[PDB]
Design a protein around this ligand. Structure first.
Ligand SMILES: O=C(O)C1=C[C@@H](O)[C@@H](O)[C@H](O)C1
Lengths: 171, 171, 171, 171
């Protein structure tokens, strides 16, 4: 019986997202969070970041044939969180073994030789507390890098060393 | 230091604020929240809004002689919340009767002939919600507008209307 | 690396384990084994022991919110070995420094005031020879007692008394 | 302000503690407090209790190779508190999840079949009031029993029964 507010998320409709066709659910509460980067263009304003959110979803649906944008949430350098598949629907961001048991949040950019700005990290972190607040994440959830669960550079050398310093990181 | 979370607030230092010099403390937990608009330029990128927070504080300090920017928090149209005097230092935004007992948050822009983006409204309500969990804001806080509290056109015709729809609104 | 069907380990399904959620892996051959007891009530039947193994998992999983019962294997007084996290997943039985480089077998019961029956000791030693045959443990593995790596009364005095005699033990 | 005013703690040198080598720090204000018990023998006089603080330390530094005794503070039945790693240094009493986010305080003795004497329970409650005064603990900190976060009988049945009673207990 826990309903009270948490965080601000730019909702699906606001970034003009094509409707989702996904239906398979995740079991509450989820234990894992997998952090990735989109290795795409970065954006630093709400307008440019909505455009970008759109280009990622578009590529995932129109080209890779997924039911919706791959991630559960995306993060913009504008410091805003963008609604992806949400807390309840299984994403498609870290392979068949990890997708069924995790929330995948992806920073929008290529963080190999750049770090995302403090407002991004802050937003990403708020998001997770919120997940815990809503009961979508276990209070003792675990943060993982994309590269820890799949062979990739994601989330980029720099954002990778950053996230290892997070309270909930577990190699 | 401090683990980065509650309602993604842009910290003082991040928006290049001059150091605060106020020492009057506020009585946690506070009953009222007064909404005002700054009546200055509006911005909508994190870059433009930090510069605007900087400009508002500068007018209050260099010109008006105040110990720091008047409001406890500033909400930019970029959808981020800006740390003014915070949850602990008594503000200066609604006169002697109200400053000691209420928390003031201000929307950056003139909202007489305009409304702020949904994201600004989200950052706002979500800032108050994050207040509660601090002890800053009592669970059942009442929200007054600047008009309901002092003879001002603030927070603007159109923004004022919106405010009255809000949940914890006791005029 | 022959094909010996060593050890009669009771499968998770047989004692009715709740599905594990652990994904962390151990690198074989593991160089260490840490012996603890559950400090709890004991069982001398394949029927109570299956139940006790359930109880223990329930504690670690429902109370402590863990990904599975902590030990890799549990030894009952009934003379059988219950599959915990097995030879390949990293247990949670002796801390951050030893978990990654060891396998934790734990005797069901409290052995401060009793030695565990010869069949339990036999289950344990055969368990270990078995691990060596599968190549999961180094032929020259070292056996430490729980209290030798973490502050605890575990594995119990009498049993600590016994494991110190064991060929593979090492201060 | 009502000037600090808290605790009569027997410092490290007074009990002769080996120089600490631990460097990793806690960030204040700390939110959780974990109550354990030494599980070993008790002590009811200053030199008697100062003798144990030294033993317990020796066991953790000499036998397990740690940088300093495990707990932040120990409670003798002489009714004194003994300095452990204190308020600022990360302890080693409840695992990698809770160590970096709590203060571990352990009663010297085994409270399975007995309770600490009023003096001891006062020394502990007073210790915590103090931590809050010094701003080393959140004013709304939570007290957890060792067994609530690690598998162990610590702090013993009867003491566990006692802390469940405490104002800041939460499981
Ligand atoms: O100051 C704090 O540590 C916090 C307290 C809670 O309200 C949380 O909801 C917040 O994210 C962090």
């Amino acid at each position: 019986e826990d309903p009270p507010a948490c965080g601000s998320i730019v909702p699906r409709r606001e970034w003009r997202a094509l409707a989702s066709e996904c239906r398979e659910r995740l079991t509450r509460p989820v234990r894992y969070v997998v952090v990735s980067h989109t290795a795409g263009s970065h954006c630093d304003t709400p307008a440019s970041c909505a455009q970008q959110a759109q280009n990622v979803q578009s590529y995932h649906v129109r080209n890779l044939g997924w039911c919706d944008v791959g991630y559960n949430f995306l993060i913009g350098e504008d410091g805003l969180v963008y609604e992806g598949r949400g807390w309840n629907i299984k994403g498609a961001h870290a392979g068949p073994t990890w997708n069924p048991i995790s929330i995948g949040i992806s920073f929008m950019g290529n963080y190999m030789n750049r770090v995302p700005p403090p407002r991004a990290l802050r937003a990403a972190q708020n998001l997770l507390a919120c997940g815990v607040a809503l009961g979508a994440l276990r209070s003792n959830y675990e943060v993982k890098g994309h590269r820890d669960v799949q062979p990739t550079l994601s989330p980029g050398d720099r954002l990778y060393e950053i996230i290892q310093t997070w309270s909930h990181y577990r190699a």
